[PDB]
Structure 1
Amino acid sequence: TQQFSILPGNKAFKGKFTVPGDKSVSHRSIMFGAIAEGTTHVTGFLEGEDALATLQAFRDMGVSIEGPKNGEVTIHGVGMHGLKAPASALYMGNSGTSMRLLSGMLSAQKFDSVMTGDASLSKRPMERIAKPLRLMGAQIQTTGEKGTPPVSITGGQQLKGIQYDLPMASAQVKSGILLAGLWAEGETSVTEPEPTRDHTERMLRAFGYDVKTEGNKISLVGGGKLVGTNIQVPSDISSAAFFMVGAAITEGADVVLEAVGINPTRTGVIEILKQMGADLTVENERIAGGEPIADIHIKGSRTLKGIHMPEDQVPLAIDEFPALFIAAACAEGQTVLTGAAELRVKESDRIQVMADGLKIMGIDCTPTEDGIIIEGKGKSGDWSPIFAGGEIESHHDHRIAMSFSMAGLRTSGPITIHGTETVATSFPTFTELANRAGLTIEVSQ
């Protein structure tokens, strides 16, 4: 166990900062850089659980890779057919993402493969991706009735593109199918019943592959070719969100977050904060590595106010609601969240864990079946403490820990957050940026 400690008192919160690279986009650059023609140089790379497992997999399959080192990776791509058979099982650790995306890719290879995982991944079913791949002609075996790992794939198959109506929305399953479709005969198409992130699609385009996005119908034609290029990874908006919130709840705060990724499938926190009356502007908009980026300028010039959060932004801000709950508490009036049933018990009930911590800090809130109700203690023009402090349980959820860390900007008492050791893995520079901004956080045993 590890814990964060924060002391009460009027904090400053200002500066120009760049948060770490987007987790998902970092991963995709490896997926496609490995099988592209020529060299790929990646910058702003953040290696997470997914990246490291995928990095090792392609190393095992003969790909030469320098790094990651200081956010830089050089990938000597081997072309669409340059992968070599792994000498043993490809260990995925806890990366279900790696396993699902590589399933599609591996099911199209000449050679056999086995994918295995740790105790947690070994329990996760893989039939939602395996089933459509089998329709394409893939030979993919799973374990037991629930179809969990190990996932055993037989190569040397001829895949055919299918038109697939996805029963349950999933960027991972969607991505797995499309990746197999790169080697398949004809067009592979996925129709998702609900909108998901499109980092896979955008990275494919960055590498020169044509991908049609036509409403909820996402498709490509197999036989194409990927071309190595330079990939600047956008900084993670999910990481930036904590400092957006911090700036919006701190008096006279002035924060510029540079090169923040603003993929429209990820920008829900911006729209929501804006609707809460936040002084938040999006300037210097441009594109890097097929991803849109911008500088986010947030000022604590006025008091947030509680709103009925827009339901059309919930899919776009799903991971940012723990941070937004902190904003809601400092806001004037009541905040209500609906249509966020996904947010409850998604193998971790963030609504309740936040509620527990918020209540400990003296905030009247109430979990609902599809969200939460928060009674904000904010008052227009008033920047007196909102939170009472206390001891907080994060349950090793980094987003919970980082959220309650921001609460230290408006607390009348000490805050101790337990189980914060996963914060550094997700957001390595979090406490550093916090300190540079004016939010001192002491890490302990």
Structure 2
Amino acid sequence: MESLTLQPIARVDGTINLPGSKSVSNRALLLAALAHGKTVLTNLLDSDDVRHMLNALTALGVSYTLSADRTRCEIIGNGGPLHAEGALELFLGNAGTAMRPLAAALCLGSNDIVLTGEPRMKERPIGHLVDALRLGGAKITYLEQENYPPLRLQGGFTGGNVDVDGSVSSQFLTALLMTAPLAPEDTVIRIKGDLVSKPYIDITLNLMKTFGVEIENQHYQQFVVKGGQSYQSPGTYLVEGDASSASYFLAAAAIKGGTVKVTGIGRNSMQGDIRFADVLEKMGATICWGDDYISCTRGELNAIDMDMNHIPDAAMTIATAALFAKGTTTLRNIYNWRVKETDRLFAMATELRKVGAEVEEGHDYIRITPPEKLNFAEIATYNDHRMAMCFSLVALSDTPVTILDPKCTAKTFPDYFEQLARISQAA
């Protein structure tokens, strides 16, 4: 299969202009499609996950145009719920930010649509969202395994009292929040127990407000939504650079800098992953904050032991950065790593051991003891963009690393290796 071998990188230094945020991009596209008016999105991410959303919108009849680099998108809002019949199949790759929000949104009114995706997506849970949608009136059928895509959506979500489990995925609540305002009746969304990864709910509410809708958030335990609302185009909207994508570059400087500055995100960002910078600071790196940048400068690197549920995606970057830290690092409260692009606790533990680390794969945590020196390994990537990006950091040592299926980074960051190369220096 395809592979890329990264030569040892002596030092990193430079500036990277970040690709757009995947989380913001897919929310903005769906809201723009539902909204009245023309929305112009700039700094939109061009990656597999966004392409699947764009293709779904095209299939649903939404009109839009894209600039040459696909980062500027002019969307003609539909002025209401999207519709299709005949069990139209929408193929969503392995994009959770397309699958979960569309699973909910397409329950408005009548419809006959099928949502499916890659094999792994048929193994990523969606039952708790389906349960909630059904409580609100939706008719949903599991075409294969109960609790997983593919789903046949036949509409009917009118609102009412809806309970949802948010203990493993915040995306189920996000999907309900974006959908409820357009339902004919008011909706009260009750969180069954605890809610995981709260920052993504804040991103959803932030985007909804940009598109003209606000709801009543009762300490994240219950959300009161008024029905009969309409989303409205914000005119021109700038998509923040991706803070999760930024993690690799900031960590690279913490390990081998130099100073690396990422632009497109700053202290005012709505993304929870900007807090990844705080972790590097706790490890001994220096961080500088700007309006539209975050930079990291090499200091030292000490192991840490902390809960990472607030930044599950960027947290993976700490797992490989730990190979360069002094002491044993423990990342806790990351059970949900198991239900993402791959089971990341199993994958991270397996690949880290290949370069020499002693690793304890806990059920919901990972403990990493770095080796005195890293060794060469051919890293398996599990169709997971972040496995490829996290392990690229192994090359900030005296050993090269070979990454299998490097193009898997395209899920969120097609140009990843060219960007890492941009800040890689020989002297």
TM tier relative to shorter chain: 0.7 to 0.9
- After TM superposition, list the pairs within 5 Å mapping 1:133-152 onto structure 2: 133-143=133-143, 146-152=146-152
Displacement of 1:158: 7.0
Aligned to 1:73: 73
Displacement of 1:429: 2.0
Aligned to 2:213: 209
Aligned to 2:317: 323
Residues 54, 355 of structure 1: alpha-carbon distance in 2 compared, 3 angstrom cutoff: closer
Structure showing greater radius of gyration is 1
Equivalent residues of 1:161, 1:222 under 8 A apart? no
Within the candidate set 274, 283, 296, 2:281 is matched to 274
**2: CA distance between counterparts of 1:332 and 1:125?**
37
Equivalent residues of 2:62, 2:78 under 8 A apart? yes
- Secondary structure of 2:406's counterpart equals coil
- Secondary structure of 1:224's counterpart equals coil
**1: CA distance between counterparts of 2:255 and 2:309?**
24
Equivalent residues of 1:323, 1:403 under 8 A apart? yes
- After TM superposition, list the pairs within 5 Å mapping 1:17-36 onto structure 2: 17-36=16-35
Structure with greater proportional helix content: 2
1:297 matches 2:281: no
- After TM superposition, list the pairs within 5 Å mapping 1:122-201 onto structure 2: 122=122, 126-143=126-143, 146-155=146-155, 157=156, 159-166=158-165, 168-182=167-181, 183-191=183-191, 193-196=194-197, 197-198=200-201, 199-201=203-205
Within the candidate set 322, 329, 334, 1:335 is matched to 329
Equivalent residues of 1:242, 1:402 under 8 A apart? yes
1:374 matches 2:368: yes
Equivalent residues of 2:4, 2:406 under 8 A apart? yes
**1: CA distance between counterparts of 2:123 and 2:377?**
36
CA RMSD of aligned residues (A): 2.8
**2: CA distance between counterparts of 1:270 and 1:5?**
28
Displacement of 1:398: 2.4
What percent identity do the matched residue pairs reach?
Answer: 27
- Secondary structure of 1:333's counterpart equals coil
Which is further off, 163-172 or 321-330? Answer: 163-172
Displacement of 1:76: 0.7
What are the Cα deviations for residues 341-368 of structure 1, in whole angstroms up to 9, with x where unaligned?
3335767343443344433333344333
Aligned length: 415
Aligned to 1:408: 395
Aligned to 1:227: 232
- Equivalent residue letter for 1:427: F
Residues 132, 325 of structure 1: alpha-carbon distance in 2 compared, 3 angstrom cutoff: closer
What are the Cα deviations for residues 240-276 of structure 1, in whole angstroms up to 9, with x where unaligned?
100111000114x111111226435333422221111
Equivalent residues of 1:128, 1:173 under 8 A apart? yes
Equivalent residues of 1:269, 1:316 under 8 A apart? no
Aligned to 2:264: 259
- Equivalent residue letter for 2:178: L
Displacement of 1:36: 1.0
Aligned to 2:106: 106
- Equivalent residue letter for 2:51: L
Displacement of 1:62: 2.5
**2: CA distance between counterparts of 1:375 and 1:240?**
25
- Secondary structure of 1:328's counterpart equals helix
- Equivalent residue letter for 1:266: D
Residues 184, 299 of structure 1: alpha-carbon distance in 2 compared, 3 angstrom cutoff: same
- Equivalent residue letter for 2:422: R
Aligned to 1:431: 417
Equivalent residues of 2:166, 2:196 under 8 A apart? no
Q: Which runs of 5+ in 2 are unaligned?
A: none
**1: CA distance between counterparts of 2:10 and 2:402?**
17
Aligned to 1:238: 244
**1: CA distance between counterparts of 2:60 and 2:404?**
40
Which is further off, 361-370 or 419-428? Answer: 361-370
Displacement of 1:231: 1.8
**1: CA distance between counterparts of 2:363 and 2:319?**
16
Provide the TM-score with structure 1 as the length reference.
0.83
1:250 matches 2:256: yes
Equivalent residues of 1:19, 1:429 under 8 A apart? no
Q: Which runs of 5+ in 1 are unaligned?
A: 285-293, 379-385, 441-445
Equivalent residues of 2:27, 2:97 under 8 A apart? no
**2: CA distance between counterparts of 1:362 and 1:126?**
36
**2: CA distance between counterparts of 1:107 and 1:36?**
16
Equivalent residues of 2:3, 2:402 under 8 A apart? yes
Residues 163, 12 of structure 1: alpha-carbon distance in 2 compared, 3 angstrom cutoff: same
**1: CA distance between counterparts of 2:132 and 2:163?**
7
- Equivalent residue letter for 2:264: A
Residues 423, 189 of structure 1: alpha-carbon distance in 2 compared, 3 angstrom cutoff: same
Equivalent residues of 1:308, 1:335 under 8 A apart? yes
- Equivalent residue letter for 1:273: L
